Each structure stands twice: as structure tokens, then as C-alpha cells.
Design a protein around this ligand. Sequence first.
Ligand SMILES: CC[C@H](C)CN(C[C@@H](O)[C@H](Cc1ccccc1)NC(=O)c1cccc(O)c1)S(=O)(=O)c1ccc2ncsc2c1
Lengths: 99, 99
Amino acid sequence: PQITLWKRPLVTIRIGGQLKEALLDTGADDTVLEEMNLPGKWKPKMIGGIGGFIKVRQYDQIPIEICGHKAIGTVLVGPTPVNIIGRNLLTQIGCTLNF
Amino acid sequence: PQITLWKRPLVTIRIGGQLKEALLDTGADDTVLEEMNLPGKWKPKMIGGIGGFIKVRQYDQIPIEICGHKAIGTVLVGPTPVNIIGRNLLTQIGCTLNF
Ligand SMILES: CC[C@H](C)CN(C[C@@H](O)[C@H](Cc1ccccc1)NC(=O)c1cccc(O)c1)S(=O)(=O)c1ccc2ncsc2c1
């Protein structure tokens, strides 16, 4: 599909049996999700943006479904105000910028 | 052009006869540039990102040529971690997400 940018590029994602709205974000290196208690091992990390840094938990090899497309990779979990699908997963679902 | 996302979508922009590198950032509502001088009146503004809120200077009706495509619109100047082109200008240059 094609998504114009008049509004925020929010789409439905699925991780386990939680469905969430998340930004398709070309400015995000990594995928950052709102606080959720995912199973398995993780590592602490700090990521920076406008306003400074937040602390996140890095979970690896998490399957995630984005608009019916299958992805699997690293997801950072922490106190972000919005769910952010970053480039690590955008490539997996075949996402490009075009103009 | 078509831009893939295995690397950061950094492009050369021209603003005030100056060449800068900026990130095409679909998760950003606004276009935010690192500290620089621009002519004319500005308004104090505050914006929020992943790490909290910052103060920026709001310049309106500023021409920027992004990867050869002309835009004229609002540019915020302040302590962003990197120059970002947000949706306000991405729409002007006809940028869409496709997968
Ligand atoms: C450095 C370039 C940018 C600012 C990085 N950010 C992505 C950017 O699209 C973020 C995404 C976002 C949206 C809404 C609330 C919080 C965050 N956008 C913004 O900061 C933003 C948003 C609205 C208006 C505005 O002027 C700026 S990010 O801070 O969210 C981010 C995301 C993923 C990531 N992975 C490693 S560092 C890192 C930082």
C-alpha cells in the first residue's frame, strides 16, 4: 500500500495477543514499544531523542505482525509516549520512502 | 527517488544558501533543525519528543530544497539531536511510505 503523510502514519501491529497502533517511523533506527511485560531475556539500554534519553529494555527476536506483514527482530520496551516501528522492522515488511 | 531503509534516510537540503544533511523522519510532525541563524521574526515554541520537551524557535514560510524538491514552510530551530525533516515538509515534496 501507499501511505501519505498528511496525518501520522499509524498502523495496527500485533505482538502476542496485544494489538497496538504504532508509527511507521523512518527517523527511528530501532523499534520502541510502550511499556509491556514481554516474556524472556532482555538487556538495559538508553536511547536518545528530542528532550533527552529514556531507559528501555531490549528484547531480541520478537515476532511482530505489521499490517499483515510478518516481521521478527529487536524491540525496545520503555516509557515512550507512542509505539514506534523503526527501520530494523520497516525493511522486513518492504517499506520505502518515495517522492 | 525511491529510498530504502537499511540505512538512515539522510538527504542533502539547501536552506539560506547553506547545504546541510537532514533525516527524512516520518515520525516527526515538525521539521526541526540544529542551532543555526535564519532571517526574520520567530516565535518561541515548545515541542515534545521521546525524552521530553524542548524550547525551539519557530520560523514560518522558509524555503528549503530537499533532495532537489522545493518546499516552503515552518522550520523549528533548537536542540534536536539531528536535523530532521518532518511531515509538514514531507507532504510538500510529495513523499509517501510504500510497502
Ligand atoms: C534522532 C532522530 C529522532 C528525533 C528520533 N526519534 C524518532 C522521531 O520520529 C520521533 C518519534 C516520536 C513521535 C512522538 C513522540 C515521541 C517520539 N519524533 C519526534 O521526536 C517528534 C514527534 C512529533 C513532533 C516533533 O517535532 C518531533 S525517537 O527519539 O523517537 C527515536 C526512535 C527510535 C530510536 N532508536 C534508536 S535511538 C531512537 C530514537
